[PDB]
Amino acid sequence: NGLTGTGVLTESNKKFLPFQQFGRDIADTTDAVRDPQTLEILDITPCSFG
Amino acid sequence: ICGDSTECSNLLLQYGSFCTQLNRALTGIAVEQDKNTQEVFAQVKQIYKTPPIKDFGGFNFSQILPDPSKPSKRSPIEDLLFNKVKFNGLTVLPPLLTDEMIAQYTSALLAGTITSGWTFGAGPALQIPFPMQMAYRFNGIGVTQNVLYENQKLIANQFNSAIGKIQDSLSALGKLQDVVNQNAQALNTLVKQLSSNFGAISSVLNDILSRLDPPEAEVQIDRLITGRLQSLQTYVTQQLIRAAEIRASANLAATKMSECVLGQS
Amino acid sequence: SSALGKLQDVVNQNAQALNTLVKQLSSNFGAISSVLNDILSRLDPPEAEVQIDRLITGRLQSLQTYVTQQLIRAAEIRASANLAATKMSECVLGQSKRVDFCGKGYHLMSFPQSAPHGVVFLHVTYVPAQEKNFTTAPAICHDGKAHFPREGVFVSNGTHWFVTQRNFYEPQIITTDNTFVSGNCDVVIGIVNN
Amino acid sequence: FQTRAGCLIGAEHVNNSYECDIPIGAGICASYQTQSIIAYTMSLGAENSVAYSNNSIAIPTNFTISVTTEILPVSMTKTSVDCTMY
Numbered sequence: 395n396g397l398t399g400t401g402v403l404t405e406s407n408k409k410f411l412p413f414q415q416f417g418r419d420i421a422d423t424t425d426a427v428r429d430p431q432t433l434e435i436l437d438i439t440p441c442s443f444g
Numbered sequence: 445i446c447g448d449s450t451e452c453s454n455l456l457l458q459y460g461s462f463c464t465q466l467n468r469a470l471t472g473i474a475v476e477q478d479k480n481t482q483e484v485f486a487q488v489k490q491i492y493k494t495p496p497i498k499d500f501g502g503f504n505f506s507q508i509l510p511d512p513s514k515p516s517k518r519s520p521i522e523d524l525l526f527n528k529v530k531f532n533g534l535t536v537l538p539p540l541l542t543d544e545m546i547a548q549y550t551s552a553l554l555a556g557t558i559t560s561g562w563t564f565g566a567g568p569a570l571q572i573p574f575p576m577q578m579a580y581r582f583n584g585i586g587v588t589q590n591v592l593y594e595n596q597k598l599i600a601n602q603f604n605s606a607i608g609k610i611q612d613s614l615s616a617l618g619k620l621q622d623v624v625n626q627n628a629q630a631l632n633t634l635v636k637q638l639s640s641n642f643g644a645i646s647s648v649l650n651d652i653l654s655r656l657d658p659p660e661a662e663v664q665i666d667r668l669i670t671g672r673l674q675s676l677q678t679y680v681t682q683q684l685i686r687a688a689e690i691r692a693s694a695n696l697a698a699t700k701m702s703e704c705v706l707g708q709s
Numbered sequence: 710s711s712a713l714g715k716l717q718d719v720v721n722q723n724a725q726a727l728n729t730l731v732k733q734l735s736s737n738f739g740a741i742s743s744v745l746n747d748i749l750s751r752l753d754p755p756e757a758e759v760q761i762d763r764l765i766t767g768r769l770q771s772l773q774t775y776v777t778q779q780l781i782r783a784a785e786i787r788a789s790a791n792l793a794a795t796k797m798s799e800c801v802l803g804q805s806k807r808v809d810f811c812g813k814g815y816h817l818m819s820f821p822q823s824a825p826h827g828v829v830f831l832h833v834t835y836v837p838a839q840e841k842n843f844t845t846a847p848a849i850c851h852d853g854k855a856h857f858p859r860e861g862v863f864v865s866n867g868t869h870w871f872v873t874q875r876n877f878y879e880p881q882i883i884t885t886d887n888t889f890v891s892g893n894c895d896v897v898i899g900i901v902n903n
Numbered sequence: 904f905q906t907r908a909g910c911l912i913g914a915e916h917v918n919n920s921y922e923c924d925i926p927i928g929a930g931i932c933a934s935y936q937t938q939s940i941i942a943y944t945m946s947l948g949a950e951n952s953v954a955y956s957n958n959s960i961a962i963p964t965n966f967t968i969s970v971t972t973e974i975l976p977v978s979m980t981k982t983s984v985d986c987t988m989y
């Protein structure tokens with residue numbers, strides 16, 4: 395719903411507050427989201443590179 | 445700079461070899477960090493071992509000899525010292541020497557000194573009893589060598605108490621800490637500089653790109669490119685200035701290891 | 710005749726930078742061409758200012774990057790020359806006692822030779838060889854007194870006791886000319902009777 | 904072959920240990936010896952065992968005169984630019 399990105403999505407085990415959509419890291423990069431339809435938290439890890 | 449997008453890569457291709465220079469600059473720094481460590485620690489031909497006894501004239505080196513009941517085989521004081529100190533294109537390479545290897549170089553330097561004095565630093569290691577080596581060293585500071593043999597027990601007790609006080613004074617390392625930090629904080633600024641527009645509409649290369657058409661978007665993408673390239677040049681220039689300061693320090697360490705550990709100054 | 714990589718390295722780094730400086734005179738930096746005779750031929754003066762400024766900014770950036778990296782490379786050549794000046798003083802016009810400063814071994818003497826942008830030192834050192842073991846004592850007890858060597862070590866070939874100098878084996882009879890006395894022979898640990 | 908520094912393809916891993924030739928990382932080097940390319944853990948150096956005792960000494964009976972070289976850069980090339988002409 396607006397957050398555009400790339401990466402691997404994985405089942406999370408963090409708990410947002412029930413009005414927060416996505417989570418950010420220190421240095422300010424999106425690293426978790428909440429699925430609008432089912433309302434579950436998913437981590438966003440980058441696509442392997444090197 | 446670009447980061448995934450493709451409208452950015454063709455525009456950045458117009459700047460020449462600015463990115464090749466920066467990668468060369470950073471690679472030179474990384475190759476210098478292994479030579480720093482080779483010059484300080486790999487100052488010994490053989491890997492020397494202490495004998496299974498510890499009859500050293502009443503001198504007790506147990507807190508600085510390696511600990512056989514460990515995977516790392518560090519000493520007690522080296523264990524005290526080690527408990528006190530993916531992104532947008534960023535990567536950390538590992539050092540060539542593990543610190544098991546570094547601890548193995550240091551223990552061999554130690555066993556060379558305790559068993560042969562200063563002879564292993566000038567050629568083949570020639571054993572000498574530790575009390576007699578201590579008496580040679582008392583001559584080097586201008587004291588007559590019976591002052592050592594008539595006071596051996598007192599001198600050994602004073603050494604042992606002074607070695608005991610060092611752990612208490614340990615369990616300081618702000619220099620190394622300073623180093624470590626100065627680098628993490630400069631790497632955090634480079635990542636934080638990616639959320640700035642530099643005078644474009646936004647700072648995210650898609651929203652600029654899916655809300656304007658090419659002629660209009662290329663103008664903003666060039667501003668983003670200019671800002672992000674300036675940030676990277678600032679970063680690399682400061683890493684170059686900070687590595688020359690670390691090299692002057694490793695050079696002082698190499699001279700100390702030669703002149704204070706492999707000889708008497 | 711059959712190793713000068715430091716000198717080579719220096720002589721090279723500079724050429725690689727000077728070539729990168731010239732190879733930047735053929736980038737657009739976001740302009741219609743890289744030639745001023747092409748922006749001054751298919752653009753009117755009000756439109757060629759905007760295209761000339763894009764080249765000016767890029768070329769200034771590239772020249773200033775060249776000048777920063779030369780300052781940083783010269784500060785490193787300066788420290789090397791400062792070390793060479795100290796080695797010429799301490800290894801060529803003297804004999805050094807510092808360990809591993811004028812070669813590996815015991816420094817005897819040094820000779821300088823000039824090189825393209827530097828200097829070669831030839832270090833002549835002494836290295837001991839072909840060691841034997843003997844047995845030692847710290848002192849000798851005799852007439853109730855303890856004797857210590859004036860400038861050597863007491864050694865034993867199995868049955869007899871001599872004095873040598875510490876770096877070269879040359880045994881001598883223990884006399885009152887190469888030893889001195891201090892104390893009685895019950896406080897030193899390891900005294901032998903002789 | 905998996906390394907602490909990444910995945911290596913086209914070299915075989917041996918169990919010997921030599922002096923480092925081409926540095927891979929985390930203690931691993933490569934060489935063209937056994938041919939092909941191999942991996943392993945570098946060697947710190949030989950192994951010397953001093954026969955230390957509470958009444959033993961070793962004394963040299965001979966010597967060698969050795970001479971070695973040391974190379975140092977003192978200068979680099981003096982260049983000038985003319986900003987306006989560049």
Ligand SMILES: *[C@@H]1O[C@H](CO)[C@@H](O[C@@H]2O[C@H](CO)[C@@H](O)[C@H](O)[C@H]2NC(C)=O)[C@H](O)[C@H]1NC(C)=O
Pocket residue numbers: 431432433
């Ligand atoms: C929106 O509708 C979908 C279905 O259209 C809901 O999904 C259901 O979620 C519950 C979880 O509590 C599941 O047990 C159901 O099986 C789901 N249904 C389907 C068809 O998958 C979703 O929960 C709705 N949104 C909200 C906020 O409730």
Ligand SMILES: *[C@@H]1O[C@H](CO)[C@@H](O[C@@H]2O[C@H](CO)[C@@H](O)[C@H](O)[C@H]2NC(C)=O)[C@H](O)[C@H]1NC(C)=O
Pocket residue numbers: 498504505506507608
């Ligand atoms: C060398 O010194 C250490 C002290 O740092 C000695 O180890 C301690 O010895 C005391 C008694 O003398 C014990 O109470 C401690 O528990 C010991 N600490 C240990 C073992 O970690 C050690 O014995 C000394 N070496 C010799 C040969 O006496």
Ligand SMILES: *[C@@H]1O[C@H](CO)[C@@H](O[C@@H]2O[C@H](CO)[C@@H](O)[C@H](O)[C@H]2NC(C)=O)[C@H](O)[C@H]1NC(C)=O
Pocket residue numbers: 840841842954961
């Ligand atoms: C000095 O004496 C020692 C004691 O024997 C010699 O060291 C031993 O040498 C033998 C044969 O080389 C080895 O097998 C032992 O492992 C050595 N260490 C011991 C016994 O602790 C040494 O060779 C002698 N040095 C010289 C120069 O003759």
Ligand SMILES: *[C@@H]1O[C@H](CO)[C@@H](O[C@@H]2O[C@H](CO)[C@@H](O)[C@H](O)[C@H]2NC(C)=O)[C@H](O)[C@H]1NC(C)=O
Pocket residue numbers: 866867868869
């Ligand atoms: C230790 O050295 C002494 C040398 O003073 C040896 O004793 C002499 O040996 C020569 C030749 O064998 C004899 O002619 C002398 O009579 C010996 N005595 C003296 C007082 O000179 C002795 O053999 C050596 N010991 C060992 C184990 O090599």
Ligand SMILES: *[C@@H]1O[C@H](CO)[C@@H](O[C@@H]2O[C@H](CO)[C@@H](O)[C@H](O)[C@H]2NC(C)=O)[C@H](O)[C@H]1NC(C)=O
Pocket residue numbers: 850902
């Ligand atoms: C070194 O010489 C002294 C004096 O010749 C020895 O001292 C004598 O030792 C014997 C045996 O222990 C005693 O019976 C005498 O009373 C001692 N005399 C004196 C004046 O102390 C000494 O033992 C010798 N050391 C060795 C290792 O043989």
Ligand SMILES: *[C@@H]1O[C@H](CO)[C@@H](O[C@@H]2O[C@H](CO)[C@@H](O)[C@H](O)[C@H]2NC(C)=O)[C@H](O)[C@H]1NC(C)=O
Pocket residue numbers: 964965966
């Ligand atoms: C000390 O070492 C030298 C070698 O550096 C020995 O001299 C050599 O002796 C062998 C055999 O006699 C000759 O083949 C060589 O030509 C000699 N070398 C030189 C440079 O002349 C010398 O004999 C040794 N001295 C002792 C006492 O062992």
Ligand SMILES: *[C@@H]1O[C@H](CO)[C@@H](O)[C@H](O)[C@H]1NC(C)=O
Pocket residue numbers: 499898899957
């Ligand atoms: C040396 O150690 C031996 C044990 O083998 C002991 O008998 C002797 O008293 C010791 N001597 C000295 C001088 O430490």
Ligand SMILES: *[C@@H]1O[C@H](CO)[C@@H](O)[C@H](O)[C@H]1NC(C)=O
Pocket residue numbers: 916917918
């Ligand atoms: C190397 O030695 C280990 C010993 O644990 C052995 O298991 C392994 O098979 C050896 N590797 C090769 C290639 O022989």
